[PDB]
Design a protein around this nucleic acid. Sequence first.
DNA 1: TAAGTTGGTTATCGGGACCGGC
DNA 2: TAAGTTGGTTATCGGGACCGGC
DNA 3: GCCGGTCCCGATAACCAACTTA
DNA 4: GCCGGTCCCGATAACCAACTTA
Lengths: 193, 192
Amino acid sequence: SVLASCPKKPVSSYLRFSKEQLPIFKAQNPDAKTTELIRRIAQRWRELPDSKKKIYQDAYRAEWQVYKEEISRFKEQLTPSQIMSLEKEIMDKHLKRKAMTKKKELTLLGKPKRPRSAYNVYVAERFQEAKGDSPQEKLKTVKENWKNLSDSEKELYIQHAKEDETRYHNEMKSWEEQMIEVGRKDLLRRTIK
Amino acid sequence: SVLASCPKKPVSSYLRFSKEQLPIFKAQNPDAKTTELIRRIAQRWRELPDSKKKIYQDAYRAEWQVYKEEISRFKEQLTPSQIMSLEKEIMDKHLKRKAMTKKKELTLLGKPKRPRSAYNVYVAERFQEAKGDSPQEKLKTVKENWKNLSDSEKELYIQHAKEDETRYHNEMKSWEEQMIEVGRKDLLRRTI
DNA sequence: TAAGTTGGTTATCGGGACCGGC
DNA sequence: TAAGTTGGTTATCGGGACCGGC
DNA sequence: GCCGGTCCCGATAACCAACTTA
DNA sequence: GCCGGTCCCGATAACCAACTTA
């Protein structure tokens, strides 16, 4: 496709150093953790004189000149909407990482789960017991049954969802006070139902 | 170009009501602020019976049906890279707004200015006095002089920037502490 | 903030419906 | 979170360099 | 309206730590 | 590397408050 074929930017002088140094350390200290080895290499990089780092730097600058030529030839043979298409795929990769990071930090601060719908409850009750082998088929058949329920048969889950709706308010009121306590008012909601 | 010709989603029932009500009100209250009028119109909308709101809603829903047809014909005649381009521009518009909001709030919390560079100082001093009438010409000749200054002459601007670098450290350290106090640890730097 | 490694935890995306915040 | 208005600020973009945070 | 999380789990693709330069 | 702000200002293109539905 597009982003696949696109030339990649050269890695830094330190990265080239670690990439070469790592297999050496891993063969001398075979049972040491890899994270330990990287920490030892980076140290070694610091100790290294400036006349030696420059060699790595001169190599990097020259690869960058190659990349500038390469990315030009590549973009020249692309149409304008295709270049925008290229930028979009790159932006998505950034946004997807930022999104991951945020979600990781919110679980770390123990943000309450969102309220489950009656249907969320329904799936939760009927799943181990479902006409299907694969979970994809099992869910597919659970949603079949849900479409055939009258409002009166739904009563148990509607009432299980009204309760969980209340649990959410409580855990949220609590969690948001605590976020103010540790100085994170940015994580509070603007609107409340 | 692309996003320009693209069909726009219909506005909401309330929005339609305000669009029509505003010119009427602006003619009843000629010297009133535009912001008061909207607050008064919105007040009028709440009071409105639901049988009257339904007329507006029904208009909106039929418009929504139109937009679905319109956006389909539009995307149907676009190439795949034009469709990604359309999404990217939409995405650019959101991010640009998010960016304005952030910069708008940081000026409200009085975040310190960034340190001026040696070249920044140089421009500020030597500018009224630059061969030119349009600012574009005055600046182009300022950058000429900057490229021809020796190290002994830049020393003055280099240490004037070294000074401002210190002011930045002072004002930032203070400001970041103040931001932890009003509960915004998110506005803090990760590095230096 | 992103790249290089590499083994050891967490997305994604399958099949859908649905609801809270923005 | 975004749309409508309308008069009233902040982008933009000209000419460039450059540096702090990520 | 739209995005994302929510119920389930099994699948593989993408993470995380350990560093630094640009 | 890349983005954005910074010195300056001059025109013009897109913003702010005031609301609510979806």
